[PDB]
Design a protein around this ligand. Structure first.
Ligand SMILES: [Cs+]
Ligand SMILES: [Cs+]
Ligand SMILES: [Cs+]
Ligand SMILES: [Cs+]
Ligand SMILES: [Cs+]
Ligand SMILES: [Cs+]
Ligand SMILES: [Cs+]
Ligand SMILES: [Cs+]
Ligand SMILES: [Cs+]
Ligand SMILES: [Cs+]
Ligand SMILES: [Cs+]
Ligand SMILES: [Cs+]
Ligand SMILES: [Cs+]
Ligand SMILES: [Cs+]
Length: 679
């Protein structure tokens, strides 16, 4: 059949990342950051992204250990995310740059070698140092992260009090449930101005979370989030599409490229309320928050960031996930599952998986095996929680937050250097600097912290049998195991929270006796692995047929997941009955996807079968559905069918249309192939 010829891509279009949505007609300068074919030009000779979160609040001004921009391992990273900007009362991106003494732009560190201010920049603070060091390391990108858990829905004032402004929720969705175009425009324009002003290379959206699951947000945000559940997906897609548009236009004007990234949830629960993550097409890449999968907000004691399911996750067992036939023995609270979820709508090159450089932990743990998959129920829950685990405290919780009364909030949160000292039987000479009285019982080292490791989970932890304390850790053994998995799956890279938690042995500390402290062991392991060779070694025509899943219920009602699939014929040909549509569904969902409309939709190629212990065994389950023999799809017309699947997916992707003996790609995915207009 004759096809319609399309002009081939030229110039910058030859460097567009695979599947990234470009702003039509705008000369976006992709080749400034990407290679031909769309792979990223990465700093320091690395094969993988190595993305470190830098937190703004470790300035050392209160006497606690500082971690400054000059302490960053610039020669071993590819990207640095600055945490956090927020959405202010005028819906603009803000770091309180105009507040006297603010750490971003109005702070200095006299006498600290390497932290000297460049007098030629019209700002001081962290940003001054970031600008300076980027000159020495010109390939390293900086991005401004916006939101996070505490400031997704509000922001802190000068007195440390939180203003419940609504943040992302009110900026993206009006109180009446419609998308807030004015707010999204103000924010997007402000992001462009911010990038231009401070020399950032991109914006990292850390909206926690645009999900329709009830009570999923920070409890402090529920009056905003719960009122918007049905609208948050549309609001988030509008935010990302508009941000993409404004940054693409700015990039074309400035002759340099601006990235949009997002910190995105690993939780299958959160994702159940996020439709198919339609917004992925706007993102240069995602940073998957494959950590805080378990923690003392509930009683289920286990790894913070398991790589794999082991069939024994105590939380999943409690909810009957392993035993329900429909779930096909897929357990989802793990890094591998989350990665495979995001491949539904992204190539591997645009996904980076997160790891923690910090601990979470419980005390008074019962059951389990050396605490693993045990139980720890707590009392006097943190504000907003109606149940909690018994979070570890004192010497087991040195990176705690404080409540309004100035009291430590339990949770077993520590930098990994402190966890390494506990393992060694060292209390840490820095305790007093954190305002921790080392003479108090809860702040003394009692019992023995025994390191455990589970290779099925790629998870280390400390178990203190005397205190019944379980601290989930991350160290060289688990990083090496995850790094192997990254390389073998050719994943885009690795993200970590946070730089200040990485460690080294410091022989001179502790009166010359030595202890662990701030360092670069884990980042160095990642870099050394990814900058050297790995340890281990299509349709020619298209048709304009469109596919989309929609009609999702509110998240709490989305069991099982049964959206409507709409197929639209935008060719000038009638698709005869028997025409076959295929597409890839990520293996995050069991390979039992079906339709409820009598179409006979089924998996024709299973990338994964059986339990996912030891990891999912492939990327995609390819699905086929045919028009019934008697039913055509006319030019310009649509047909819908109800589908059902059992765990969240993004995408789908990689569509083909099987028409009169020939297989076509679709123009939405393959815009430069010659295409079928008439047949
Ligand atoms: Cs090389
Ligand atoms: Cs350094
Ligand atoms: Cs300087
Ligand atoms: Cs200087
Ligand atoms: Cs988070
Ligand atoms: Cs935090
Ligand atoms: Cs179960
Ligand atoms: Cs020990
Ligand atoms: Cs975190
Ligand atoms: Cs090899
Ligand atoms: Cs039917
Ligand atoms: Cs497959
Ligand atoms: Cs297996
Ligand atoms: Cs494989």
């Amino acid at each position: 059949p004759p096809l319609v010829q399309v002009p081939p891509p030229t110039g910058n279009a030859l460097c567009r990342p695979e599947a990234l949505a470009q702003t039509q007609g705008v000369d976006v300068p992709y080749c400034a950051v990407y290679k031909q074919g769309g792979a990223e030009q990465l700093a320091n000779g690395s094969r993988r992204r190595i993305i470190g979160y830098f937190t703004s609040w470790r300035t050392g001004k209160d006497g606690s250990p500082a971690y400054l921009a000059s302490d960053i391992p610039w020669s071993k990273l590819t990207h640095i995310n600055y945490a956090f900007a927020h959405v202010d009362g005028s819906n603009k991106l803000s770091v309180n740059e105009t507040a006297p003494g603010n750490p971003a732009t109005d702070m200095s560190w006299p006498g600290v070698a390497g932290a000297e201010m460049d007098a030629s920049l019209p700002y001081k603070g962290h940003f001054n140092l970031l600008t300076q060091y980027k000159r020495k390391y010109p390939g390293v990108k900086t991005l401004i992260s916006v939101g996070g858990w505490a400031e997704t829905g509000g922001y802190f004032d000068a007195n440390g009090k939180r203003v419940a402004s609504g943040g992302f929720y009110s900026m993206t969705v009006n109180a009446d449930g419609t998308v807030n175009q004015a707010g999204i425009n103000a924010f997007s324009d402000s992001a462009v101005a911010f990038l231009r002003k401070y020399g950032f290379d991109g914006v990292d959206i850390d909206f926690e979370y645009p999900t329709s699951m009830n009570n999923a947000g920070n409890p402090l945000d529920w009056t905003f989030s719960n009122a918007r559940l049905g609208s948050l997906n549309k609001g988030y897609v509008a935010l990302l599409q508009t941000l993409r548009d404004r940054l693409d236009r700015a990039a074309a004007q400035d002759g340099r490229y601006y990235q949009i990234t997002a910190a995105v949830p690993a939780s299958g629960y959160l994702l159940r309320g996020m439709e198919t993550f339609q917004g992925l097409k706007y993102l240069d890449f995602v940073n998957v928050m494959s950590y805080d999968l378990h923690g003392a907000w509930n009683r289920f004691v286990g790894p913070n960031a398991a790589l794999y399911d082991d069939g024994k996750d105590a939380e999943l067992a409690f909810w009957n996930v392993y035993s329900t036939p429909q779930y096909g023995n897929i357990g989802y609270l793990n890094t591998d599952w989350a990665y495979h979820y995001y491949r539904g709508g992204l190539p591997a090159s645009r996904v980076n998986m997160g790891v923690p450089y910090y601990t979470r932990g419980w005390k008074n743990v019962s059951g389990g095996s050396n605490g693993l998959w045990g139980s720890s129920v707590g009392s006097n829950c943190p504000a907003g929680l109606t149940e909690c685990g018994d979070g570890a405290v004192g010497i087991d919780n040195i990176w705690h937050d404080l409540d309004d009364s100035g009291k430590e909030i339990p949770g077993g949160s520590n930098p990994m250097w402190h966890a390494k000292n506990l393992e060694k039987g060292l209390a840490g000479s820095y305790l007093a600097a954190y305002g921790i009285d080392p003479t108090l019982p809860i702040n003394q080292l009692t019992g023995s912290y025994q390191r455990n490791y589970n290779g099925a989970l790629a998870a280390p932890w400390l178990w203190n049998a005397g205190k019944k304390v379980f601290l989930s850790t991350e160290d060289e053994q688990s990083i090496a195991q995850k790094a192997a998995w990254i390389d073998a799956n050719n994943v885009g890279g690795v993200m970590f929270w946070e730089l200040a938690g990485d460690y080294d042995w410091k022989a001179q500390r502790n009166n010359g006796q030595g202890e662990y402290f701030i360092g670069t062991t884990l980042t160095s392991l990642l870099y050394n692995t990814f900058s050297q060779p790995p340890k281990v070694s299509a349709p020619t025509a298209a048709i304009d047929v469109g596919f989309s899943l929609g009609g999702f219920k509110l998240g709490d009602q989305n069991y099982p997941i049964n959206p409507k699939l709409t197929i639209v014929n935008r060719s000038q040909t009638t698709l005869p009955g028997g025409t076959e549509f295929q597409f890839d569904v990520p293996t995050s969902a069991p390979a039992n996807i079906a339709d409820q409309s009598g179409f006979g939709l089924k998996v024709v190629s299973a990338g994964h079968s059986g339990s996912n212990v030891g990891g999912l065994k492939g990327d995609f389950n390819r699905v086929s559905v045919k028009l019934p023999s008697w039913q055509s799809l006319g030019a310009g017309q649509s047909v819908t069918l109800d589908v059902v699947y059992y765990l969240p997916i993004s995408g789908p992707s990689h569509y083909t249309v099987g028409l009169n003996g020939k297989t076509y790609a679709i123009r939405d995915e393959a815009p430069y192939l010659p295409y079928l207009r008439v047949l």
